[PDB]
Amino acid sequence: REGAETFADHREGILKTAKVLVEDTKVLVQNAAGSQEKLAQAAQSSVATITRLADVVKLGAASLGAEDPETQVVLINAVKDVAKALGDLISATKAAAGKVGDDPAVWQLKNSAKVMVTNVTSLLKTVKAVEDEATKGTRALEATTEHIRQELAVFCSPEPPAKTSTPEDFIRMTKGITMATAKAVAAGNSCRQEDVIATANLSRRAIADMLRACKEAAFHPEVAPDVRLRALHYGRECANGYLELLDHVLLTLQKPNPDLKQQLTGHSKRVAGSVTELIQAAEAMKGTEWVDPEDPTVIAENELLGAAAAIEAAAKKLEQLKPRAKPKEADESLNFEEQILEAVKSIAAATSALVKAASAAQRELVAQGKVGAIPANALDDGQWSQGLISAARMVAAATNNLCEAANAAVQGHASQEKLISSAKQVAASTAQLLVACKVKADQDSEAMKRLQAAGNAVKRASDNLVKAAQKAAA
């Protein structure tokens, strides 16, 4: 929360937007009939609705503040699911088009429209929960359980996903889920609304990636399809038990009696055994032995040095770009490119500050020897470190891509699509690199403090680039 702002404005704004969404889907229903013009009109109208929706929900989460990250996260996941299901309806319409109601495809389309209606209701309830600290818990739990129910629904659909996930990342998901349900039972003991919602968000991230990655990994071709049949089977039951634990979570919060508590505990360990079934299937399916190439430390400082050098070089090779008044290369002579270039240079400086703060945080981490004498810490921090290194190499790539964005803006780009794509992916890349940093980080350590300072610097860089780009070409 910054400045003297308050949330109620956002509350009502998203209220209006949710209404508008209701009529947007209602109209697009019949817009399935007609020619492309009417349907596209209502499509783009919905587009604008969800756009201002995203904006106002962003500012509402900002209104919520850092104090309770859980509320922002849960509502943003809600609006995320809303948007994705919107896209689901959009794609189906794009398919289920030019066919009158009798078509099974458009029949499914109507059903999906009703499903989106339910999703909108869910989002309404999410807003309700956003209003009151009094009872966020049960409603977050609901959102959670119907959420996972519809991922189940996706799972019952035999479909080809993008990739087939690695069994090792998948089994990391498995163990994360076991510790997750450990925390879940812990919170059930706690009977604390804030702990409830935090655990809920923990679920909607962890178990979601769990079950999906189960799907992709099983869907790997070369492995014996019986292996994946067993994997999908066991994942079905694990989802079932996850749901059952969730249900008993609801009951326990309503019914603090110990009977439901011990029931939930035992059910959780049943589910843990099922998770071990997934684990055994996963180790069965993986046909390879060695995973960790190099120790997390040495690679971490290779990352530190390389990223520091890369971003200082990026700042320098951006400084050698100057705001120039030539229209032959810079196809638009508007001073907005001047403003953008100055902002981009500031962004380079912010990214340099970011790599320095990350360097300091990493140095502190390796100074404590957080990589751990235990081999378990060796491997887990190895994968942490390698992911963070990928993150840093790709943010170096993003900063460079910013460098070529600036150089081409000097050369003239005039179709700001590539430039803004680059800027946005810089923002997201920085985000994920910070995330990799924040892994298992003692919150009140000064390393995290200056690291988050530099992260905020780059976030202001992201805001500045966003505002310039929307300003750019009006």
Phi, psi of 197 (to 5 degrees): -70, -35
CA pair distance 149, 155, nearest whole angstrom: 10
The three state secondary structure string of 7-35 is CHHHHHHHHHHHHHHHHHHHHHHHHCCCC
Q: Which tokens go with 159?
A: 């479909």
292: left (phi over 0), alpha (psi -120 to 50) or beta: beta
10 Å CB burial of residue 201 (0-12, 13-18, 19+) is: buried
Question: CA 23 → CA 34, 53, 441, 443, 470, distances in Å?
Answer: 18, 14, 45, 45, 28
Q: Which tokens go with 75?
A: 């509502």
C-alpha 21: how far from its chain's center?
23
Long-range contacts of 37-43 (CB under 8 A, 24+ apart): 39/93, 39/97, 43/90, 43/93
Q: What is the CA radius of gyration of the chain?
A: 25
The residue type of 184 is A
The residue type of 135 is T
CA pair distance 373, 295, nearest whole angstrom: 12
Other C-beta atoms closer than 10 Å to the C-beta of 60 total 24
Residue found by looking up tokens 């604390």 in the block:
192
Other C-beta atoms closer than 10 Å to the C-beta of 447 total 20
Question: CA 418 → CA 133, 182, 323, 401, 413, distances in Å?
Answer: 42, 45, 20, 10, 8
| Nearest Cα to Cα of residue 237 among 271, 186, 283, 208 | 271
- Experimental technique, in short, is cryo-EM
Q: Say if CB 414 and CB 331 are below 8 A apart.
A: yes
Positive or negative, the CA dihedral 144, 145, 146, 149 is: positive
| Nearest Cα to Cα of residue 148 among 268, 255, 245, 274 | 245
CA pair distance 234, 432, nearest whole angstrom: 31
CA pair distance 382, 295, nearest whole angstrom: 6
Q: Say if CB 71 and CB 130 are below 8 A apart.
A: yes
Q: Say if CB 241 and CB 270 are below 8 A apart.
A: yes
